[PDB]
UniProtKB/Swiss-Prot annotation, chains A, C, D, E:
It comes from Rotavirus A (strain RVA/Cow/United States/NCDV-Lincoln/1969/G6P6[1]). SUPFAM superfamilies: A virus capsid protein alpha-helical domain, Viral protein domain. Ca(2+) binds at residues 266, 286. The N-terminus is blocked. Belongs to the rotavirus VP6 family. Residues 62-73 are annotated as: Interaction with the inner capsid protein VP2. This is Intermediate capsid protein VP6. GO terms for biological process: fusion of virus membrane with host plasma membrane. Zn(2+) binds at residue 153. Pfam families: Rota_Capsid_VP6. The lineage of its organism: Viruses, Riboviria, Orthornavirae, Duplornaviricota, Resentoviricetes.
Length: 397, 49, 397, 397, 397
């Protein structure tokens, strides 16, 4: 595996630092490394593909070295080189792809393909080099077992979930109380509604709460918390819990009262914020708990008083809400986010080559299904597969 | 010591000795006895090096 | 061109690796490369400017060189160097800017300025070096006529478009059926409304559809698809299609029924998702088609039944919608996105120097106008101009 | 300080380029640099900690240099090295953290800790190198004085502010006119409402305006401007200005008329856009001014006419709005944004070690409070502290 | 750590292979290994204890080797040896115990004690050997990264849970329908009861279901499944769900109809058995789902008919049940089972020395509490602590 990495920074730091011009000396340390490779290869034989609509291709090696001679680089030098790189490019592609599809329950971590199982071989280790690529940097540290880590913008930690819970309801659904929400990606929106506007509630206040349990701990999270849930601020006709009928939601929004956000880790409060909207930091948590209340306005102008009668029918439904967005965070486990193309690369290669559903990943690499049951096997396979996608993107985008 | 001689010096030692820093040397070596009370007084053992 | 690049990584990997202290042999391979340049230059005259409010500073060359002694670097060494770099800095700026405005119908893909036309010269080629800056990496691969590629978080593929289409309407606009949408940047929101709540529709279901044709293919797209179009979930007074009057939209939202998203490429379905909300992957497409339906609720509580009478007036307007956001994607053509400053750099330099409108780009480098008629000439000029902006940002931000 | 930097790229470009396999020569220029360090160190002793729950560990040195056993490294070479790096890792951590808490009004832009005050010493400068890490690149340029610069996605320039201003009101709050808004992070949403729908207004048009003053100038900003403020498009019950009662807001949305956005710098219009929605560029500004109008529809279908009577009660409240989002921009001062973890790192280390509130930063490193009163002292301390966080993240995430 | 191991198999394979007589050559390969140790030791002082009722015994080293001369060991040889072993015995005990209590939330997987933190030192690793003790065999493979695995008998995967769920109930509790169960250790017993004997049920059949979610996946499980739940086959007086009163359960047992056991893994059926009683294999699962029905007997002798009237009172309560026992299984995580003494050893040492409750383990090392919230930290600490207990049991039982 680490092998694989090199093969690339080799080519990039190659197809990049080698052109009509430049002095030898700025690549001396480079040329060398390169050749070393060629040698180890030549003679050895390979095979890739043979699964689904994936072409089976065989490759051999027998190439010249490099003029460690010349001072400057003449055009002619390049072309006689690019022609030799373009076999490694078109190669690696066919290599990544081959091990970017196979899954395995037991050792879902290690290599699978007849291509790679031969790479981890010892005689090839004579090639590692420059591992500053964020992903490999982390692959290694994970073998030595130590605190790893990645960087994500609008991460994808929440499996899609859009539902409601009626804490007080009746057949006519004309005087409900409960919450409705949307957890998806890096965002949570939750609204608490009370058709009665807490008319008979103690202290004329109805308490609400929304708890979200992350499948993986997030650390160093920068979060935006805002009052109101715009998504649940408009009239809706919704299916009843049993699917037998439909109810009407006609919200009127009030400011959420006594807002308290807790970021917990293993049941312990790590961060707590009381009514603080804007940007807040949650440094280490596996659970978010949002508590907020609807307090019946003690003083109401006529127009307001008219919305909240002492007796039914309750036609304007008092609603309070919150919106929370995780802009960035660090996770010890790989995840999909709003910037990285890893998930899309893996999913795309599998789709393009009609790769059959395997024993580890959900059909279509479905993110919601994956994160909902993010088993150790799925994570090890995902990391292997994401690391390969990142190696591939250094050369092929 | 062995690991030094059989490999030339980089002065690592040269520097430590120079900014006069606490250091040790391992392995077999000559050795010289001396009875001169005075000697000690002229911190001879700080020479040789 | 490639020339230009070097001139920078030269300075950055310079103004960065030369500081009071460092050991020489960390820069040996560097110093060299540097000098080589100076030589090639000294003995050449340059001119920049001569357009709108752009100065016309002139430059000459005749400089010394650098020692190759000293184990470590003495302050005195730096200053006698920084003073020589600050002429190249203040130079390049005036160079980039000069070729970052001239556009050409013809070969708008090639060099323009009296400054650069002289750089592509052969006697200068002796300078290229370290092309790992994502943009140059891609410039080359393109000149060699090959498969390109870029990275974008929240790309800007949709020209702004906010409108509606009334499939059933009448003068009073009291019983309409149609769709309204907002396509902008990387997002699409579309709502289908039926004032009659499909009362007389076959199977009490009204079908809707929204098609968006991208001006460029996007590959490896990570997309968020959510039910509902919040933007079209509130009461509105809208201008009629002919602009002669205004109609009233009073939505009540129902879940979109039989949602089907198709990502097509040249008329072929590449990816299709049926009612899958959350994160989905579209691996290669030039068109998005969103189909969804409004199905009259077969069972209604009194409160709901009251919104949907058998006869007009229809006062609550049944609405179903979808929201689709392209978080990240790869495009073979340069585009503006939510993270890169290229478009802003080019637009800003032109605005600051009062550069006159040219024959290629729309007034003000207007993105919507540009992407709406993204001709080959505009793309070649945009790429040239974006690549230069990226070269400039390595030194000047 | 610059010292500190090296200590890292030293280790990264180390724990990365040093693997069981690469040829010596691919690190010759590297090994050297390394050793040089060891020397300078060994002997001098250090203290870290001594505050809140921050452990006070004493670090002493005593290490042998580095072999060279030619022709690619043998495993044995690595381990005897990693064991020596893991003391520097666990060290630096304890070093960053120590100077990542102390603050100082007078000269709080320089080193504070007994650990660092000793690093700026002269006998250490003999190390500095490879300053390509965006942040250091900018630290230096600032010590000499020159056009610095940083890159941010969805920047955090607006302190949280959610309020309203009633330009026409009365006790019953049944015929109000004014604006309400939410400024937070990189986004602004503002709505102008007129309960009377400009029935008695000159030209039946009510003018609105929203001005936002940035605490720091933003340059090269890519901005999304869209009509409508979804956040203020739904029914609300709001507290009166004096907190004595609550009013009812029942919006109906019309298109904002004569939209004009001005990006000003020191009172001067730098960029102005008239009714241009979509993506616009604001190249240099410290103030944003949004002007828009509500124009009573001159022609109304019956359904519309019914919402806007000639006399009170006014039950449907005409509302027009705008949404503006700064996707990316450059700032000469450090800021929090939606991608960088700096603020979160600093805030997290302080929270984890129970660091007491100091004289410079607001309690909890609260972003809104910080940006609201972004004094020179807070900025210098923030930059020092952000630069250290970035040095730390090269090794520890 | 691995260090620790050796120290034992050293002594066991020692205090065992050294008896008055044996011909030397059965130990030549042994004696050696031994001595090697003594050397590395002598000269280094050690400290243990320092909490609760744990003495703070200090230790020192300075021992003669072991004449490898003789051909046949004479009694005199033994005694002069046993006297030197009995210091290592009484030592190791005091060593294990010391690190068999300390816990850490963060890196609660690594060494803690001032005794062990010094053992992982490098100058000590000159000892490791003969890692065939099932537990170490697995410690390594885990530190190396691979499919671990342990062997059990009547494993302890189910936290104690004894309860019921009334699907149909009323205040008098005279016509209930629901299930009651006992999940504990490796066994599950569940009964479904219907006081009405499905008199008004569709097809005169009442469906039941019992789902149990394991906290860890079990593989290669040999399971006994039998019809009937003896535990719920006798008359009971039970507390009501709200604790306000007591109900009467008077069961009469019928054979469970349409029994289906599913062993699922991440929602997928891995094994399914339809009405198969006796021994069944579940090869990989994290969930067990037992579905069974009560079918009203279509033909009844008078005595039977008399138990099931068409109208209340229902005095004989129809009950169907299942019993499932996991005889053996493999788990990738350590667990308590019916044969291993690890949990008991750890729990016993802590109890005997009055070790205070720490931050990781529940009070008293309570198994139910531990397995109910089997966090990664608890598992890493448990494995460390179980591995040490196993090292200790090689010498001290
Ligand atoms: Zn974003
Ligand atoms: Zn048994």
């Amino acid at each position: 595996m680490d092998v694989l990495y090199s093969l690339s920074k080799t080519l990039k730091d190659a197809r990049d630092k080698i052109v009509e011009g430049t002095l030898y000396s700025n690549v001396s340390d480079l040329i060398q490394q390169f050749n070393q490779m060629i040698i180890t290869m030549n003679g050895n034989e390979f095979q890739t593909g043979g699964i689904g609509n994936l072409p089976i291709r065989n490759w051999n090696f027998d190439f010249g070295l490099l003029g460690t001679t010349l001072l400057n680089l003449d055009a002619n030098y390049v072309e006689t080189a690019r022609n030799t790189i373009d076999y490694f490019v078109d190669f690696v592609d066919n290599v990544c792809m081959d091990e970017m599809v196979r899954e395995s329950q037991r050792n879902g971590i290690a290599p699978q393909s007849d291509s790679l199982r031969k790479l981890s071989g010892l005689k090839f280790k004579r090639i590692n080099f420059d591992n500053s690529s964020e992903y490999i940097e982390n692959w290694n540290l994970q073998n030595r077992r130590q605190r790893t880590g990645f960087t994500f913008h609008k991460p994808n930690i929440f499996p899609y979930s859009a539902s409601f819970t009626l804490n007080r309801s009746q057949p006519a659904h004309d005087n409900l109380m409960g919450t409705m929400w949307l957890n998806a990606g890096s965002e949570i929106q939750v609204a608490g509604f009370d058709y009665s506007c807490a008319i008979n509630a103690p202290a004329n206040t109805q308490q609400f709460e929304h708890i979200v349990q992350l499948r993986r701990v997030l650390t160093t999270a920068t979060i935006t918390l805002l009052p109101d849930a715009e998504r649940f601020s408009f009239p809706r006709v919704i299916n009843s819990a049993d699917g037998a009928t439909t109810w009407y939601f006609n919200p009127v929004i009030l400011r959420p009262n006594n807002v308290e956000v807790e970021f917990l880790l293993n049941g312990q409060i790590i961060n707590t914020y009381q009514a603080r909207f804007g940007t807040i930091i949650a440094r280490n948590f596996d659970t978010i708990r949002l508590s907020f209340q609807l307090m019946r306005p003690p003083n109401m102008t006529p127009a307001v008083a008219a919305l909240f009668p002492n007796a039914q029918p309750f036609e304007h439904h008092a609603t309070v809400g919150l919106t929370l967005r995780i802009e960035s965070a660090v996770c010890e486990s790989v995840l999909a986010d709003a910037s990285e193309t890893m998930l899309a690369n893996v999913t795309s290669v599998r789709q393009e080559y009609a790769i059959p559903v395997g024993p580890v990943f959900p059909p279509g690499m479905n993110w919601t299904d994956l994160i909902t049951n993010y088993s150790p096997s799925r994570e090890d396979n995902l990391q292997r597969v994401f690391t390969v996608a990142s190696i591939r993107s250094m050369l092929v985008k | 010591l062995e690991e030094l001689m059989r490999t030339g010096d980089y002065a690592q030692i040269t520097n430590m000795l120079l900014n006069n820093q606490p250091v040790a040397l391992v392995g077999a070596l000559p050795f010289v006895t001396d009875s001169s009370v005075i000697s000690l007084i002229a911190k001879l053992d700080a020479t040789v090096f």
